[model samples]
Target: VSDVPRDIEVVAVTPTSALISWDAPAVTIRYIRLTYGETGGNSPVQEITLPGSKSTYTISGLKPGTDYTVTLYSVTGRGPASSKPASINFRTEI
Candidate 1:
């Protein structure tokens, strides 16, 4: 049987570090994009390409005392898909 799940996980989020964990979905994921900005707003997407087996990803280079929104993408050799999105807010040390 193919080892994959419908939805992945977004765990351990901080101002400067974000941990993203996910399961396979029977196809190769070309990449996933993480997006953020401020409340009542959002910035441009930050892209990260997956190597098809890597399950964990960490994102750094963020600011303190600010809020953000984070979502995921499952990419195939063809393109990406729109699954249920996850949003969370965090802040850095002052």
Candidate 2:
């Protein structure tokens, strides 16, 4: 029912920023949704959706030396049809 992205990577850039990259799946995708938050903190989650053609994004305004988890989902249509989420965890530089 869904196709997921591959080779997802997260790179810490600074105390308040990071870079995310991934390869599109084999199936067609309308857009990609990214959601992220502190690994176990109570902060509100952050989300963004990018056109399917994009393969990389930069996330800013993060806490320094903190661990966070980011998830990516590939959607193929206007509805809820989407790939199983892919996730990765990384820590920002202090």
Candidate 3:
């Protein structure tokens, strides 16, 4: 059965970037999509796509001291493989 990504973490941060990590679901996946944007702000959403084997990523070009929310989705060949995506909120370092 399909399962959501687990243990999503924002392990590190900088003025212009954030390091995030997570564990894959129990079943196989085709890829993972990460979407983020400033929390309750006007900035356009940013996104990244990673292969199934990746468990960590560093999102760059973020504004300093800003609050943001990141959402993750695991996809299989058939469709989005999870019942619900995982999300986390964090602030960039000043």
| CA RMSD of all predictions | 4.3, 1.6, 1.8
Local lDDT at 4 for model 3: 70
Model 1, position 63, has a per-residue lDDT of: 64
Instruction: Tally clashing residue pairs in candidate 1.
Output: 0
Output the number of the lDDT-best candidate: 2
Put down candidate 2 lDDT per residue, 30-65, tens digits, no spaces. Answer: 999999999988899999999987999899989899
lDDT by residue for model 3 (1-94), tens: 2557789999999999999999988888888888999988888998888897799999999999999999998878763444377899999998
lDDT: worst 10-residue window of model 1? 1-10
Q: What TM-score would every model get versus the actual structure?
A: 0.57, 0.92, 0.90
Clashes of each: 0, 0, 0
lDDT of 1: 0.55
lDDT of 1 by residue, 23-93 (tens): 65575555544444554565555655556666676767866655655555554456245434444555543
Q: Rank the candidates by TM-score, best first.
A: 2, 3, 1
Superposed model 1: Cα runs more than 4 Å off: 1-7, 26-42, 78-94
lDDT of 3 at 43: 85
**How well does model 2 score by local distance difference test?**
0.88
